[PDB]
Design a protein around this ligand. Structure first.
Ligand SMILES: Nc1nc(O)c2cc(C[C@@H](C(=O)O)c3ccc(C(=O)N[C@@H](CCC(=O)O)C(=O)O)cc3)ccc2n1
Ligand SMILES: Nc1nc(O)c2cc(C[C@@H](C(=O)O)c3ccc(C(=O)N[C@@H](CCC(=O)O)C(=O)O)cc3)ccc2n1
Ligand SMILES: NCC(=O)N[C@@H]1O[C@H](COP(=O)([O-])[O-])[C@@H](O)[C@H]1O
Ligand SMILES: NCC(=O)N[C@@H]1O[C@H](COP(=O)([O-])[O-])[C@@H](O)[C@H]1O
Lengths: 209, 209
């Protein structure tokens, strides 16, 4: 089972995935890690693990379509069974989403449908929500509109800073992402009729309950 | 629980609603029926049931805003708890949608998002669909774009005419519309964050599953 991970920054989720393959919780391997930022430390995590790395700078391309195309061309050298977005700060084109339909995953730092887009933690905290979390879902063209597979809620108390809750959510992300990937790896997770299905059963709008 | 129905034609769905209130499946009453067509037989259905009727002709108004305004003014004489569109062939203005936000329902003759608008049936046959149906949803300014509450699928077999399928879908409509209205009447159905919620639970893009 070949996994290709796409990142943009630190890559703590990438690390959790790497560790899960190592323990075999995930019966597969991370074949490659792609980044749109040359600096991303995640690349360094993959490097140290003997995993291949690649970098595609948006400037070197003259259109989003041209960029994803070279991305698809590159990612495919590894014959991935699933493409995983772990902190990938770049929106993917419909062509790309199409090419990996049903096998493209992402983990959004909020309790979807709440706060699609960037700056989740802040909004959650500035709006005064008593509950925050993360959501792993199948990627569709709609910015975080795809079928939610699993969420991990996290209590929000007075006094918690933006970083406090962020580190709290992160701890959950490291738990549910590798898990969702393992479900996928065992052919227990699929998507059709734009819905997410676990063990053959339809999952609710907010993921496995 | 006061219900105000808006129609344009025969009113078979109106009748199903009327019958459901009679049996108390819906714990409420159709207080009035409005139509934008003087001929609509639905008016006679209501008439025979001892229900009040009203007609508002578009020609008698010089703008859509003026028309809905008078519509709101009239509908409100009946202090409705919910306004139900049953075959109403007229697009309502934002102000109107706003005034009945969360308490305005419609039943579209197709499996939304597929075939928003008119000519559902014909497109289904034409586009060679193996499945057709109806969708009850909360009304928002987006033409059949609001939160779908419940759909009723219907199989399509070679040999089926546009009338064969239409009559098949109608039969379903008479079943799910009164049902959805009862959910609403029991305070079990609500809309917030532009989503449909049944028994406190968020419903999928396709309605209750
Ligand atoms: N088609 C598609 N659908 C999704 O749901 C995607 C989901 C993701 C991750 C997502 C996160 O979980 O939240 C996410 C959502 C939004 C942006 C963004 O706007 N980034 C750029 C803007 C556009 C770009 O440069 O790509 C910025 O600098 O603000 C970056 C990641 C990435 C690509 C996606 N692509
Ligand atoms: N604001 C609003 N939003 C919706 O979603 C509505 C949904 C409905 C029913 C709908 C059905 O599901 O099918 C529906 C779909 C299309 C037309 C239409 O084009 N009507 C006019 C156009 C303009 C007018 O009303 O004068 C015509 O003569 O084609 C009328 C109702 C009626 C009014 C609505 N109003
Ligand atoms: N564009 C994707 C996105 O929203 N990523 C989010 O940014 C953080 C980076 O974690 P990381 O250590 O896994 O890189 C994670 O919390 C992840 O959900
Ligand atoms: N614009 C509304 C609309 O498309 N309504 C649809 O027209 C038919 C009329 O039924 P009826 O008059 O016998 O209830 C119904 O099938 C309804 O879904």
């Amino acid at each position: 089972m070949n996994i290709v991970v796409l990142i943009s920054g630190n890559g703590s989720n990438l690390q959790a995935i790497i560790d899960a393959c190592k323990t075999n919780k995930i019966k597969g391997t991370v074949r490659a890690v792609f980044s749109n930022k040359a600096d991303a430390f995640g690349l360094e995590r993959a490097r140290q693990a003997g995993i291949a790395t690649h970098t595609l700078i948006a400037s070197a391309f003259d259109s989003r379509e041209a960029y994803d195309r070279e991305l698809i061309h590159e990612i495919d050298m590894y014959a991935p069974d699933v493409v995983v977005l772990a902190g990938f700060m770049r929106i993917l084109s419909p062509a790309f989403v199409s090419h990996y339909a049903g096998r493209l995953l992402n983990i959004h730092p909020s309790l979807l449908p709440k706060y699609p887009g960037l700056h989740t933690h802040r909004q959650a905290l500035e709006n005064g929500d008593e509950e925050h979390g993360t959501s792993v879902h199948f990627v569709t063209d709609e910015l975080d509109g795809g079928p939610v597979i699993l969420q991990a809620k996290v209590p929000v108390f007075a006094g918690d800073s933006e970083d406090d809750i962020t580190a709290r959510v992160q701890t959950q992300e490291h738990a549910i992402y590798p898990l969702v990937i393992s479900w996928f790896a065992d052919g227990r997770l699929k998507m059709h009729e734009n819905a997410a299905w676990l063990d053959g059963q339809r999952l609710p709008p907010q993921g496995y309950a």
